[PDB]
Amino acid sequence: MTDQAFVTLTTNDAYAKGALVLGSSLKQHRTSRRLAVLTTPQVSDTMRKALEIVFDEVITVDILDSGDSAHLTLMKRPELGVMLTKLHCWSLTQYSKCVFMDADTLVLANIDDLFEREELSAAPDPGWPDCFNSGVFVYQPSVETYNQLLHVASEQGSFDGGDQGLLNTFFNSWATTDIRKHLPFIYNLSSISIYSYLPAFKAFGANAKVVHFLGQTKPWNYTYDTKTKSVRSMTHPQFLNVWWDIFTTSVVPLLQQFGL
Amino acid sequence: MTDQAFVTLTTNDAYAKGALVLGSSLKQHRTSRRLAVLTTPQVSDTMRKALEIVFDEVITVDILDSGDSAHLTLMKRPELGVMLTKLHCWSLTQYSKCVFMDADTLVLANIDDLFEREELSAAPDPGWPDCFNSGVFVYQPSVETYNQLLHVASEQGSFDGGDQGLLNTFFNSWATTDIRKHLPFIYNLSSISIYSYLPAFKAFGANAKVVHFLGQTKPWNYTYDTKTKSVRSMTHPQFLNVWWDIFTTSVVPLLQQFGL
Numbered sequence: 001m002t003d004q005a006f007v008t009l010t011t012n013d014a015y016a017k018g019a020l021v022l023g024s025s026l027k028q029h030r031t032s033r034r035l036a037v038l039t040t041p042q043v044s045d046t047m048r049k050a051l052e053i054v055f056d057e058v059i060t061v062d063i064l065d066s067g068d069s070a071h072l073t074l075m076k077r078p079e080l081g082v083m084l085t086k087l088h089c090w091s092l093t094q095y096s097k098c099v100f101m102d103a104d105t106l107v108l109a110n111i112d113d114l115f116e117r118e119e120l121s122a123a124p125d126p127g128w129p130d131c132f133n134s135g136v137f138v139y140q141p142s143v144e145t146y147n148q149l150l151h152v153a154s155e156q157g158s159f160d161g162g163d164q165g166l167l168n169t170f171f172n173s174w175a176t177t178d179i180r181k182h183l184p185f186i187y188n189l190s191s192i193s194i195y196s197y198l199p200a201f202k203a204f205g206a207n208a209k210v211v212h213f214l215g216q217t218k219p220w221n222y223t224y225d226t227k228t229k230s231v232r233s234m235t236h237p238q239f240l241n242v243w244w245d246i247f248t249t250s251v252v253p254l255l256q257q258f259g260l
Numbered sequence: 261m262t263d264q265a266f267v268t269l270t271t272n273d274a275y276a277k278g279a280l281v282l283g284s285s286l287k288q289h290r291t292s293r294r295l296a297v298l299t300t301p302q303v304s305d306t307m308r309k310a311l312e313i314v315f316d317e318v319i320t321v322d323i324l325d326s327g328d329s330a331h332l333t334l335m336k337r338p339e340l341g342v343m344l345t346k347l348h349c350w351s352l353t354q355y356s357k358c359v360f361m362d363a364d365t366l367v368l369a370n371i372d373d374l375f376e377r378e379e380l381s382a383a384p385d386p387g388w389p390d391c392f393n394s395g396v397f398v399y400q401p402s403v404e405t406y407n408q409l410l411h412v413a414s415e416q417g418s419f420d421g422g423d424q425g426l427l428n429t430f431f432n433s434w435a436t437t438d439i440r441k442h443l444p445f446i447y448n449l450s451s452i453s454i455y456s457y458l459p460a461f462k463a464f465g466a467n468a469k470v471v472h473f474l475g476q477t478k479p480w481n482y483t484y485d486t487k488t489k490s491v492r493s494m495t496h497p498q499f500l501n502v503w504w505d506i507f508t509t510s511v512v513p514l515l516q517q518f519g520l
């Protein structure tokens with residue numbers, strides 16, 4: 001548990017807000033694991049300093065630098081920058097097992113039981129459910145795996161322009177092999193699904209442990225009324241409201257005195 | 261194989277067209293199994309006669325009749341009519357194992373290997389992928405199972421108003437148990453997904469064995485140009501076009517001389 005971690009990634013300040021809320025939500029639900037965040041030089045110094053408070057480890061990744069293992073793949077396929085940066089999660093060999101969570105996820109309950117899982121365990125992606133959604137996955141840091149992923153990234157790219165395509169291509173037995181590597185959908189609950197199959201959300205949505213904010217508007221792009229504790233208009237804003245409650249209650253106060 | 265069957269359901273003439281195309285597509289791809297269709301008295305006599313040509317067995321279900329086992333459940337929950345009728349698929353104990361396919365599915369390749377599967381095997385539903393989509397499932401006829409399903413239908417209804425909710429509730433270990441009961445998504449490929457995750461469709465859609473026509477427009481509600489062999493406008497109408505090719509080529513000619 002001391003050598004296990006939740007790992008996220010922020011490549012900018014907007015997603016840094018995501019990561020800060022995510023990390024705060026993990027602390028709120030009393031994870032016994034470490035919290036690590038991949039950051040890039042495009043993340044501002046104050047966001048980085050905030051990340052240093054919320055996270056146990058802030059790891060700077062600069063894929064634009066020739067010294068980075070992924071740099072040559074980035075030059076070949078520059079559009080794969082976010083993915084290549086994310087793949088550095090496999091470089092974190094100080095950890096024996098990690099749960100990667102995208103900075104646009106939100107933890108609603110302790111999910112430390114994810115560390116019982118093996119690489120690669122991920123929840124099904126809605127839309128194409130024989131692919132896993134790469135917003136939340138259990139993996140084992142390994143330079144070997146990292147190199148292998150980089151190699152596939154270089155050779156093939158990713159069928160969807162992101163880490164999800166590449167991770168599915170690499171971890172391609174997921175759909176047909178080992179039900180235990182199917183994380184329950186509630187560990188990576190697509191915010192889109194919270195209305196795409198509304199009866200199912202009503203039936204099973206109360207069990208949500210992780211909400212994954214997808215769609216063209218991320219939580220930080222909403223307006224939140226701190227008096228009514230509600231985002232301003234999707235009659236299930238409960239999750240957005242949790243995100244904003246954490247952001248306004250825990251995250252902003254953390255940054256709010258940086259001017260000092 | 262002689263006691264195994266594909267089973268579909270038509271509760272009206274529009275879906276009877278679906279069933280006829282479905283059954284024709286199964287014959288086209290050379291199933292060695294029987295073809296059975298549940299029909300209702302709301303299906304016209306000529307549609308029924310067409311079904312008698314395409315299918316090996318046409319089974320009439322009249323849930324509006326007090327003599328039907330499901331009738332009392334129908335009176336209790338009248339909106340569950342389609343589902344209750346569908347559940348009669350479990351009454352077909354002349355078969356040892358069946359693949360149920362909704363009348364809005366379309367077979368693109370032989371799928372007889374589905375009969376290797378056990379009850380309940382179904383593909384994940386996009387949208388809520390810890391539920392299976394009940395458009396295509398492998399099941400074993402059993403009066404006992406039928407009665408148990410009716411009982412749950414009576415007691416609880418269905419969380420989504422259809423067979424899918426009830427079947428998921430009953431076969432609730434699907435998401436967490438036995439990867440072999442996850443049919444590959446290509447055995448029940450949502451027509452909606454054919455654009456909801458477009459990169460995935462491009463990556464894996466060529467493997468489609470069954471297309472499931474979802475959305476507010478069923479294939480028979482489209483206009484098909486027989487000269488250009490294309491439905492008239494979703495830049496993947498290929499599947500609609502297959503459906504219409506079968507309908508215009510095999511199904512309509514079958515009915516076209518009924519006036520005689």
Ligand SMILES: [Cl-]
Binds near residue numbers: 179438
């Ligand atoms: Cl398994």
